[PDB]
Short mmCIF file of N, CA and C in Angstrom, two decimals:
data_model
loop_
_atom_site.label_atom_id
_atom_site.label_comp_id
_atom_site.label_asym_id
_atom_site.label_seq_id
_atom_site.Cartn_x
_atom_site.Cartn_y
_atom_site.Cartn_z
N UNK A 1 -167.53 -87.41 -127.11
CA UNK A 1 -166.08 -87.98 -126.79
C UNK A 1 -165.12 -87.28 -126.67
N UNK A 2 -164.31 -86.89 -125.63
CA UNK A 2 -163.63 -85.85 -125.52
C UNK A 2 -162.00 -86.69 -125.46
N UNK A 3 -161.21 -87.22 -126.73
CA UNK A 3 -159.77 -87.87 -126.86
C UNK A 3 -158.89 -87.44 -126.04
N UNK A 4 -157.63 -88.09 -125.70
CA UNK A 4 -156.55 -88.28 -124.86
C UNK A 4 -155.90 -86.38 -125.21
N UNK A 5 -155.49 -86.15 -126.39
CA UNK A 5 -155.19 -85.08 -127.11
C UNK A 5 -156.28 -83.49 -126.35
N UNK A 6 -157.34 -84.20 -126.70
CA UNK A 6 -158.60 -83.06 -126.09
C UNK A 6 -158.08 -82.82 -124.99
N UNK A 7 -158.13 -83.87 -124.03
CA UNK A 7 -157.66 -83.14 -122.37
C UNK A 7 -156.90 -82.69 -122.32
N UNK A 8 -155.32 -83.08 -122.79
CA UNK A 8 -154.28 -82.23 -122.68
C UNK A 8 -154.39 -81.12 -122.74
N UNK A 9 -154.94 -81.01 -124.16
CA UNK A 9 -155.47 -79.68 -124.58
C UNK A 9 -156.18 -78.54 -123.49
N UNK A 10 -157.01 -79.16 -123.13
CA UNK A 10 -157.82 -78.47 -122.16
C UNK A 10 -157.24 -78.40 -120.64
N UNK A 11 -156.61 -79.37 -120.16
CA UNK A 11 -155.87 -79.41 -118.90
C UNK A 11 -154.62 -78.26 -119.46
N UNK A 12 -154.09 -78.20 -120.16
CA UNK A 12 -153.27 -76.63 -120.24
C UNK A 12 -153.44 -75.88 -120.86
N UNK A 13 -154.71 -75.32 -120.92
CA UNK A 13 -155.52 -74.24 -120.57
C UNK A 13 -155.81 -73.55 -119.85
N UNK A 14 -155.94 -74.68 -118.76
CA UNK A 14 -156.79 -74.25 -116.91
C UNK A 14 -155.33 -73.79 -116.74
N UNK A 15 -154.41 -74.66 -116.61
CA UNK A 15 -152.94 -74.40 -116.31
C UNK A 15 -151.75 -73.08 -116.86
N UNK A 16 -153.00 -71.99 -117.82
CA UNK A 16 -151.89 -71.30 -118.99
C UNK A 16 -150.96 -70.66 -117.88
N UNK A 17 -151.46 -69.90 -117.26
CA UNK A 17 -151.46 -68.83 -116.05
C UNK A 17 -149.85 -68.95 -115.21
N UNK A 18 -150.37 -70.19 -114.97
CA UNK A 18 -149.63 -70.82 -113.99
C UNK A 18 -148.04 -71.51 -114.19
N UNK A 19 -146.64 -72.18 -114.14
CA UNK A 19 -145.74 -72.43 -114.93
C UNK A 19 -145.37 -73.66 -115.02
N UNK A 20 -146.08 -74.12 -115.46
CA UNK A 20 -146.52 -75.75 -115.24
C UNK A 20 -145.83 -76.55 -116.84
N UNK A 21 -144.57 -77.15 -116.98
CA UNK A 21 -144.19 -77.54 -117.55
C UNK A 21 -145.26 -78.76 -118.65
N UNK A 22 -145.00 -78.65 -119.98
CA UNK A 22 -145.88 -79.63 -120.73
C UNK A 22 -145.90 -81.06 -120.61
N UNK A 23 -144.81 -81.47 -119.88
CA UNK A 23 -144.69 -82.84 -119.02
C UNK A 23 -145.24 -83.28 -118.47
N UNK A 24 -145.74 -82.28 -117.52
CA UNK A 24 -145.82 -82.38 -116.02
C UNK A 24 -147.89 -82.40 -116.23
N UNK A 25 -148.29 -81.66 -117.39
CA UNK A 25 -149.64 -81.69 -117.80
C UNK A 25 -150.27 -83.03 -118.40
N UNK A 26 -149.24 -83.63 -119.17
CA UNK A 26 -149.49 -85.10 -119.70
C UNK A 26 -149.17 -86.20 -118.39
N UNK A 27 -148.60 -85.71 -117.45
CA UNK A 27 -148.47 -86.72 -116.13
C UNK A 27 -149.64 -86.57 -115.57
N UNK A 28 -150.34 -85.23 -115.48
CA UNK A 28 -151.65 -84.99 -114.51
C UNK A 28 -152.73 -85.95 -115.55
N UNK A 29 -152.94 -85.59 -116.71
CA UNK A 29 -153.94 -86.31 -117.24
C UNK A 29 -153.92 -87.73 -117.16
N UNK A 30 -152.37 -88.40 -117.22
CA UNK A 30 -152.95 -89.50 -117.57
C UNK A 30 -152.81 -90.21 -116.43
N UNK A 31 -152.55 -89.66 -115.24
CA UNK A 31 -153.01 -89.90 -114.16
C UNK A 31 -154.15 -90.34 -113.68
N UNK A 32 -155.29 -89.57 -114.31
CA UNK A 32 -156.53 -89.36 -113.48
C UNK A 32 -157.32 -89.72 -114.94
N UNK A 33 -157.20 -90.99 -115.75
CA UNK A 33 -157.54 -90.89 -117.05
C UNK A 33 -159.07 -90.87 -117.12
N UNK A 34 -159.79 -91.51 -115.86
CA UNK A 34 -161.26 -91.31 -115.83
C UNK A 34 -162.42 -90.40 -115.42
N UNK A 35 -161.45 -89.26 -115.01
CA UNK A 35 -161.83 -87.92 -114.66
C UNK A 35 -162.14 -87.15 -115.53
N UNK A 36 -163.71 -86.15 -115.38
CA UNK A 36 -163.92 -85.22 -116.29
C UNK A 36 -163.11 -84.31 -116.49
N UNK A 37 -163.50 -83.21 -117.11
CA UNK A 37 -162.44 -82.12 -117.37
C UNK A 37 -162.51 -81.18 -116.43
N UNK A 38 -164.21 -81.26 -116.00
CA UNK A 38 -164.29 -80.54 -114.65
C UNK A 38 -163.33 -80.72 -113.46
N UNK A 39 -162.87 -82.23 -113.40
CA UNK A 39 -161.91 -82.23 -112.41
C UNK A 39 -160.64 -82.07 -112.59
N UNK A 40 -159.96 -81.46 -113.65
CA UNK A 40 -158.74 -80.54 -113.24
C UNK A 40 -158.89 -78.81 -113.04
N UNK A 41 -160.06 -79.07 -113.18
CA UNK A 41 -160.34 -77.26 -112.73
C UNK A 41 -160.85 -77.06 -111.36
N UNK A 42 -161.28 -77.85 -111.27
CA UNK A 42 -161.46 -78.32 -109.35
C UNK A 42 -160.07 -78.46 -108.69
N UNK A 43 -159.30 -79.15 -109.18
CA UNK A 43 -158.12 -79.56 -108.83
C UNK A 43 -157.56 -77.95 -108.76
N UNK A 44 -157.39 -77.17 -109.44
CA UNK A 44 -156.68 -76.06 -109.57
C UNK A 44 -157.59 -75.35 -108.50
N UNK A 45 -158.38 -75.10 -108.35
CA UNK A 45 -159.44 -73.86 -107.74
C UNK A 45 -158.80 -74.76 -106.00
N UNK A 46 -158.70 -75.62 -105.91
CA UNK A 46 -158.49 -76.01 -104.65
C UNK A 46 -157.05 -75.42 -104.06
N UNK A 47 -156.32 -75.57 -104.62
CA UNK A 47 -154.62 -75.42 -104.87
C UNK A 47 -154.93 -73.79 -104.64
N UNK A 48 -155.81 -73.16 -105.37
CA UNK A 48 -155.45 -71.61 -105.13
C UNK A 48 -156.27 -71.49 -103.50
N UNK A 49 -157.54 -71.69 -103.69
CA UNK A 49 -158.05 -72.19 -102.09
C UNK A 49 -157.26 -71.57 -100.89
N UNK A 50 -156.71 -72.94 -100.58
CA UNK A 50 -155.22 -73.07 -100.02
C UNK A 50 -154.41 -71.86 -99.88
N UNK A 51 -153.90 -71.75 -101.04
CA UNK A 51 -152.87 -70.52 -101.43
C UNK A 51 -153.52 -69.07 -100.78
N UNK A 52 -154.69 -68.83 -101.06
CA UNK A 52 -155.28 -67.59 -100.60
C UNK A 52 -155.49 -67.76 -99.03
N UNK A 53 -155.83 -68.69 -98.90
CA UNK A 53 -155.96 -68.49 -97.16
C UNK A 53 -154.83 -68.42 -96.39
N UNK A 54 -153.47 -68.94 -97.13
CA UNK A 54 -152.37 -68.55 -96.56
C UNK A 54 -152.09 -67.00 -96.43
N UNK A 55 -152.66 -66.73 -97.66
CA UNK A 55 -152.31 -65.36 -98.10
C UNK A 55 -152.78 -64.00 -97.17
N UNK A 56 -154.39 -64.92 -96.70
CA UNK A 56 -155.16 -63.93 -95.94
C UNK A 56 -154.50 -63.54 -94.39
N UNK A 57 -153.77 -64.98 -94.10
CA UNK A 57 -153.46 -64.64 -92.78
C UNK A 57 -152.05 -64.17 -92.78
N UNK A 58 -150.90 -64.16 -93.54
CA UNK A 58 -149.81 -63.48 -94.16
C UNK A 58 -149.88 -61.70 -94.13
N UNK A 59 -150.96 -61.25 -94.71
CA UNK A 59 -151.47 -59.58 -95.02
C UNK A 59 -152.20 -59.32 -93.65
N UNK A 60 -152.86 -59.91 -92.51
CA UNK A 60 -152.83 -59.92 -91.11
C UNK A 60 -151.95 -59.54 -90.19
N UNK A 61 -150.93 -60.59 -90.49
CA UNK A 61 -149.84 -60.49 -89.31
C UNK A 61 -148.80 -59.04 -90.14
N UNK A 62 -148.94 -58.94 -91.39
CA UNK A 62 -148.06 -58.05 -91.69
C UNK A 62 -148.93 -56.51 -91.52
N UNK A 63 -150.07 -56.45 -91.56
CA UNK A 63 -151.14 -55.20 -91.14
C UNK A 63 -150.61 -55.13 -89.45
N UNK A 64 -150.82 -56.14 -88.69
CA UNK A 64 -150.77 -55.70 -87.29
C UNK A 64 -148.96 -55.39 -87.31
N UNK A 65 -148.18 -55.85 -87.62
CA UNK A 65 -146.79 -55.13 -87.25
C UNK A 65 -146.53 -53.72 -87.93
N UNK A 66 -147.08 -53.50 -89.64
CA UNK A 66 -146.97 -52.35 -89.70
C UNK A 66 -147.83 -51.44 -88.96
N UNK A 67 -148.72 -50.97 -88.05
CA UNK A 67 -149.66 -50.62 -87.43
C UNK A 67 -148.77 -50.11 -85.81
N UNK A 68 -147.95 -51.00 -85.82
CA UNK A 68 -147.08 -51.10 -84.60
C UNK A 68 -145.90 -49.86 -84.61
N UNK A 69 -145.82 -49.90 -85.99
CA UNK A 69 -144.59 -48.79 -86.36
C UNK A 69 -144.93 -47.57 -87.16
N UNK A 70 -146.69 -47.42 -87.23
CA UNK A 70 -147.01 -46.47 -88.11
C UNK A 70 -146.78 -46.65 -89.47
N UNK A 71 -146.11 -47.57 -90.05
CA UNK A 71 -146.20 -47.79 -91.40
C UNK A 71 -147.33 -47.59 -92.62
N UNK A 72 -146.86 -46.91 -93.73
CA UNK A 72 -148.04 -46.61 -94.63
C UNK A 72 -147.45 -47.33 -95.99
N UNK A 73 -146.45 -48.43 -95.62
CA UNK A 73 -146.35 -49.25 -97.12
C UNK A 73 -147.64 -50.49 -97.22
N UNK A 74 -147.73 -51.06 -98.17
CA UNK A 74 -149.19 -51.28 -98.22
C UNK A 74 -149.07 -53.05 -97.67
N UNK A 75 -149.89 -53.77 -98.24
CA UNK A 75 -149.58 -55.38 -97.58
C UNK A 75 -149.14 -55.97 -98.76
N UNK A 76 -148.31 -56.97 -98.36
CA UNK A 76 -147.73 -57.89 -99.45
C UNK A 76 -148.71 -58.81 -100.62
N UNK A 77 -148.53 -58.63 -102.09
CA UNK A 77 -149.28 -59.09 -102.96
C UNK A 77 -149.19 -60.71 -102.91
N UNK A 78 -150.14 -60.86 -103.41
CA UNK A 78 -150.33 -62.32 -103.41
C UNK A 78 -149.68 -63.14 -104.37
N UNK A 79 -148.99 -64.43 -104.11
CA UNK A 79 -147.72 -64.67 -105.02
C UNK A 79 -148.39 -66.14 -105.56
N UNK A 80 -148.37 -66.21 -107.01
CA UNK A 80 -148.88 -67.62 -107.53
C UNK A 80 -148.56 -68.76 -106.92
N UNK A 81 -149.47 -69.71 -106.41
CA UNK A 81 -148.46 -71.18 -105.86
C UNK A 81 -147.47 -71.50 -106.87
N UNK A 82 -146.47 -72.33 -106.69
CA UNK A 82 -145.17 -73.28 -106.82
C UNK A 82 -145.58 -74.34 -107.65
N UNK A 83 -146.54 -74.39 -109.07
CA UNK A 83 -147.54 -75.38 -109.22
C UNK A 83 -146.50 -76.95 -109.72
N UNK A 84 -146.07 -77.68 -108.71
CA UNK A 84 -145.04 -78.54 -108.82
C UNK A 84 -146.15 -79.93 -109.41
N UNK A 85 -145.33 -81.09 -109.82
CA UNK A 85 -146.06 -82.06 -110.28
C UNK A 85 -146.67 -82.98 -109.03
N UNK A 86 -145.59 -83.15 -108.19
CA UNK A 86 -145.86 -83.94 -106.91
C UNK A 86 -147.17 -83.04 -105.83
N UNK A 87 -147.13 -81.92 -106.03
CA UNK A 87 -148.33 -81.11 -105.36
C UNK A 87 -149.38 -81.03 -106.15
N UNK A 88 -149.52 -81.31 -107.46
CA UNK A 88 -150.73 -81.36 -108.22
C UNK A 88 -151.03 -82.98 -108.04
N UNK A 89 -150.27 -83.80 -108.06
CA UNK A 89 -150.94 -84.89 -108.14
C UNK A 89 -151.55 -85.53 -106.49
N UNK A 90 -151.04 -84.65 -105.69
CA UNK A 90 -151.19 -85.00 -104.04
C UNK A 90 -152.78 -84.21 -104.10
N UNK A 91 -153.00 -82.63 -104.48
CA UNK A 91 -154.30 -82.39 -104.53
C UNK A 91 -155.16 -83.07 -105.55
N UNK A 92 -155.18 -83.95 -106.49
CA UNK A 92 -155.83 -84.60 -107.55
C UNK A 92 -156.05 -86.11 -106.67
N UNK A 93 -154.94 -86.77 -105.98
CA UNK A 93 -155.72 -87.71 -104.77
C UNK A 93 -156.58 -87.41 -103.85
N UNK A 94 -156.51 -86.07 -103.40
CA UNK A 94 -157.23 -85.96 -102.50
C UNK A 94 -158.78 -86.09 -102.93
N UNK A 95 -159.16 -85.42 -103.97
CA UNK A 95 -160.18 -85.14 -104.54
C UNK A 95 -160.78 -86.27 -104.93
N UNK A 96 -159.96 -87.69 -105.68
CA UNK A 96 -160.79 -88.40 -105.78
C UNK A 96 -161.37 -89.41 -104.35
N UNK A 97 -160.70 -89.25 -103.51
CA UNK A 97 -161.26 -89.92 -102.28
C UNK A 97 -162.78 -90.09 -101.67
N UNK A 98 -163.67 -89.10 -101.97
CA UNK A 98 -164.94 -89.13 -102.25
C UNK A 98 -165.75 -90.02 -103.41
N UNK A 99 -164.88 -90.08 -104.32
CA UNK A 99 -165.41 -90.92 -105.16
C UNK A 99 -165.04 -92.51 -105.29
#
């Protein structure tokens, strides 16, 4: 049996490298009280999936532009998604519709 504190603790560790306030992790867990720990990992992976796909397109456009002016500067670096509560709750709500 994983307790509420247990789950807040795991969810905090999923989002450790992201910049998420403790209060927002709490709200996230309390909003999805019936979901496994696997749920919050799937949620993060879904937000990064999206963000990486955007970045691919960004790098592509930038690279095409650099080739026209023979620029040797490298591509733009991936920037972390800004993980706001409303966005996290949205992704969470998308994941629940299968269930």
